[PDB]
Design a protein around this ligand. Sequence first.
Ligand SMILES: [Cl-]
Ligand SMILES: [Cl-]
Ligand SMILES: [Co+2]
Length: 162
Amino acid sequence: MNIFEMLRIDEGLRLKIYKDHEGYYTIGIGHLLTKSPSLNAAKSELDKAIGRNTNGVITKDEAEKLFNQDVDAAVRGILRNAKLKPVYDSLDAVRRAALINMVFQMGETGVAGFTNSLRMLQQKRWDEAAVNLAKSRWYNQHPNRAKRVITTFRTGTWDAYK
Ligand SMILES: [Cl-]
Ligand SMILES: [Cl-]
Ligand SMILES: [Co+2]
């Protein structure tokens, strides 16, 4: 399995503009367009992003392209961050993907804010990190997904994903 398949499972695929669980406009595979109420605003971001008059609807290839860019960006964010890099480096392949998933969903900056879980991950204190991760708004607002990720961190296997 890999980060791509994993996030595809977590975020699903939508070709038409949609409002997310928080009421934000998104499209594709978890690509946030804007946090604004204006559907026009979202259309415009979209057109800006795709390079064409989309009218809120995109193609699968277009979707996968925003996905690659987005996955790329998450990693860069990780590598740029003084708090995230070292943890990332200390992790194994499966766990790195779990970190990416989180950076992707909440941003580099939101993730760097989980000071305590990051320390625990850095020390390989799997069980405790997982307990700590679950005490968040993240988890409470995304019970199912958050559980697959936390689990992945805990086991270092793709089991939550099979
Ligand atoms: Cl973009
Ligand atoms: Cl969820
Ligand atoms: Co959310």
